[PDB]
């Protein structure tokens, strides 16, 4: 492949950025009504995880250029908040966060993955808002990470078993 | 000259920075290249501090990683470890100098500093940055994860803040 350690990249950082442009039409469409200006009414990003911080980063840039100003929050009442997460698998985590930022009651409530994972359910989650969708395969880069590790790769690829296997006999 | 309103003057672009950004990545490379770097087994743990350095951090760990400098990702807002702390701005250098000192108190590698911007001339302590992205003066800034009572980080620019929204909004 083009890296030594991955046997298919999944969706490349050209792909993502072009999606997320896309999705940040899609929000900024549907918060035309919403009034959102710097410090009065910025929409609000919720980052949870501890790898969805580049996909943060991007993200609330790329919203500033499509005129939706953001103020960012992370967790590692008359507001529209919005949850940001890396990749949405198991889908239990947001649930709990979702369900969560409702307590202390917000205008709105979306929710915004980079990677979605539908096939991992284990309750029925819909996040509003999906850059991409990728098979039950495990995808390093944008982030994401296998023990800490490969968060800083530009694209979403899938690790080589001998990544995995050979980083095995390392450990004991 | 400003691009925007809520800014008098645009110091630094997202286009000025990652150059910079890029250079700086090299020397991290030369001067870490004899630690035999390798993923899981002994990574550059870049330790991101604030709530600000979050997008240095996310654009400063794909040119480290363009240049081979694996990294493991650690939020402060690591024994027998190299760690490089990450810093959007550097002021007094006070917030910088406990996080170092309570890193140093687990006895890491190595451990040196990385800012984005430096305020040289806001110095309480002295500090000295083993790396540096940009020099600013004795101005507020915002942008690049610098921000206005949590606003503005969304700036792709590092830009002088206007006194009209902080007098008006500061009241
Ligand atoms: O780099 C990765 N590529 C993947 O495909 C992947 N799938 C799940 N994870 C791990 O899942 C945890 C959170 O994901 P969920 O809450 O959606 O289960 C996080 O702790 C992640 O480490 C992955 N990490
Ligand atoms: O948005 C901002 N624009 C600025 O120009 C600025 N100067 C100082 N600060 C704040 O002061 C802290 C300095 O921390 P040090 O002790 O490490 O110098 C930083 O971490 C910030 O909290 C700024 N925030
Ligand atoms: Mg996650
Ligand atoms: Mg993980
Ligand atoms: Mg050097
Ligand atoms: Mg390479």
Redesign the interface.
């Known amino acids: 492949c083009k890296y030594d350690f991955a046997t298919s990249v999944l969706f490349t950082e050209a792909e993502l950025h072009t999606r997320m442009r896309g999705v940040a039409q899609r929000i900024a469409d549907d918060y035309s009504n919403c009034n959102l200006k710097?410090?009065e009414n910025?929409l609000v990003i919720v980052?949870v995880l501890?790898g969805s911080?580049?996909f943060?980063?991007?993200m609330?840039?790329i919203?500033?250029?499509f005129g939706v100003?953001?103020?960012?929050?992370?967790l590692?009442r008359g507001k529209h908040v919005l949850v940001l997460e890396d990749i949405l698998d198991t889908a239990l985590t947001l649930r709990e966060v979702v369900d969560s930022l409702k307590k202390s009651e917000p205008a709105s409530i979306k929710t915004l993955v980079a990677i979605d994972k539908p096939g991992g359910r284990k309750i029925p989650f819909t996040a509003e808002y999906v850059v991409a969708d990728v098979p039950n395969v495990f995808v390093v880069g944008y982030?994401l990470?296998?023990?800490?590790?490969?968060?800083?790769?530009?694209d979403v690829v899938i690790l080589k078993p001998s990544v995995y296997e050979t980083?095995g006999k390392?450990l004991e």
């Not at 100003?69 to 992370?74: L, N, S």
């Open positions: 710097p410090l910025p980052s501890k911080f580049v943060t980063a991007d609330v840039r919203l500033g250029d100003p953001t103020r960012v929050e992370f590692r982030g990470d296998y023990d800490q590790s490969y968060r800083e790769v530009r980083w390392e």
